[PDB]
Design a protein around this ligand. Structure first.
Ligand SMILES: CC(=O)N[C@H]1[C@H]([C@H](O)[C@H](O)COC(C)=O)O[C@@](O)(C(=O)O)C[C@@H]1O
Length: 451
């Protein structure tokens, strides 16, 4: 029996094999809207649990409105064939329009054409810059280059018009008929086999979503191979000099296949994006050229009281790495320590801000498999203490890990926390077995309890 003042719901399954005709599901993401709706998005991995390639993977989402029930799941982003959309990240953000606070929900996801995934991705942005404009590259089977331009007219490398058009959905039209799709590995002209980040947004509290916008052009560097969403959530900076900025954690690989964490950020409410440096970038080390040492991969971000950023990162070492940014994620302090409270078995993790005070301190919630392996799902509570400053004027925040509660003793993999309107926490996690994506709720007391 749990203690008298404790809240913990028996886990339910929000996605499972067969649901929406999908054989497989992975990669939980969970965000709460300002209207108090919980969004749970997921990889609808149609052909099984395996990553890209050789998987028809789409984006699925479920909504639960405040004092409502889990509504039915929808596929909200679908690509031709076995082209994959993999690893989603949700972010609820607001903009003061008139004097009305308007809310937009952003989702980003990594996207690959048929035949491609992390293990075999090619390099590049997928675009050619010609006189300031970015143009979508197509390749023929003899590896010549074409670009997509005005009205989807396909130009060749000599710079002249072909008899091909590409529609937005990557459909290829030649002399009236549809002759293929640029994302399908059997198309006469193909997109570059490389990672993209695509974004969709929702203006109606998750009910409906935009068409995908490729974020690659002008953002992903030509030297990057993998370039991808760090699944979980993004955040909008609440306070400090960079209030209002959108912050989406990502990671990428260089020409040596070395993995570096970073964030992409927007100061114009998602209109344009910029790439921050990796915590891997110092004056000693460049994430472009690095080829040895601790890799920093998937990551999630929290904001300290004055707006300073903390990026928690899956990595090749034994414990979680934390990076600090003083400039809204543009750059990180040179020093990137482990937290030896946060054992890191090489798995995605979730970290979030908590809106209320806990023992009169501000707090974050963390979850991951606390073990050498993907077992022992544990949710921790971290109290934030100031303890000094930096040569540079800004406070030096440290983590007190007061609660550390096992919520799943056996298998536990990817998870994502969210704060509920009522002040409780949701957790959307892998590990219930058999492709089943589990959602549970609990309160702070649940976390205080010692087994
Ligand atoms: C493939 C992808 O885009 N993302 C996947 C990620 C990723 O391949 C990893 O971060 C890179 O490092 C490795 C492969 O060693 O790893 C997972 O395969 C896993 O479960 O670990 C699931 C996740 O969807």
């Amino acid at each position: 029996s749990h203690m008298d003042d404790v809240y913990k719901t028996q886990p339910v399954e929000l996605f499972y094999p067969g649901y929406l005709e999908s054989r497989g599901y992975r990669i939980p993401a969970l965000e709460t809207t300002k209207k108090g709706t919980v969004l749970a998005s997921i990889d609808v991995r149609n052909n099984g649990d395996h990553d890209a390639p050789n998987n028809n993977i789409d984006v699925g989402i479920r909504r639960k409105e405040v004092n409502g029930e889990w509504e039915e799941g929808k596929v909200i982003l679908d690509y031709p064939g076995k082209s994959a959309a993999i690893d989603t990240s949700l972010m609820s953000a607001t903009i003061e329009e008139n004097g009305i606070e308007k809310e937009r929900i952003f989702l980003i996801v990594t996207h690959f054409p048929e035949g491609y995934g992390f293990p075999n991705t090619e390099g590049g942005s997928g675009y050619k810059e010609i006189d300031g404009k970015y143009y979508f590259i197509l390749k023929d089977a003899q590896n010549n280059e074409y670009t997509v331009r005005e009205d989807g007219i396909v130009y060749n490398s000599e710079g002249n018009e072909t008899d091909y058009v590409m529609k937005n959905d990557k459909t290829l039209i030649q002399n009236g008929e549809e002759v293929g799709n640029a994302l399908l590995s059997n198309s006469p002209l193909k997109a570059v086999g490389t990672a993209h980040i695509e974004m969709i947004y929702s203006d109606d509290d998750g009910n409906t979503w935009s068409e995908p916008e490729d974020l690659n052009p002008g953002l992903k560097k030509e030297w990057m191979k993998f370039f991808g969403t760090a699944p979980g959530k993004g955040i909008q900076i609440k306070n400090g000099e960079h209030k209002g900025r959108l912050v989406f954690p990502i990671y990428y690989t260089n020409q040596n296949n070395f993995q570096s964490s970073a964030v992409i950020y927007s100061d114009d409410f998602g209109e344009t994006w910029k790439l921050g440096e990796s915590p891997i970038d110092t004056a000693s080390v460049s994430s472009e050229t690095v080829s040895s040492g601790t890799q920093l991969t998937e990551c999630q971000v929290v904001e300290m009281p004055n707006g300073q950023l903390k990026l928690f990162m899956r990595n090749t070492g034994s414990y979680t790495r934390i990076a600090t940014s003083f400039d809204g994620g543009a750059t990180w302090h040179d020093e990137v320590p482990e937290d030896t409270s946060l054992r890191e078995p090489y798995c995605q993790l979730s970290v979030i801000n908590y809106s209320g005070k806990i023992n009169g301190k501000d707090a974050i919630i963390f979850s991951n498999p606390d073990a050498s392996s993907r077992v022992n799902g544990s949710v921790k509570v971290g109290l934030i203490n100031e303890n000094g400053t930096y040569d540079n004027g800004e406070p030096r925040y440290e983590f007190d890990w007061i609660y550390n509660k096992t919520v799943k003793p056996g298998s536990f993999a990817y998870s994502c926390l969210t704060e509920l309107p009522d002040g409780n926490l949701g957790l959307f996690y892998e590990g219930e077995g058999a492709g089943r994506m589990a959602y549970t709720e609990f309160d702070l007391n649940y976390l205080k309890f010692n087994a």
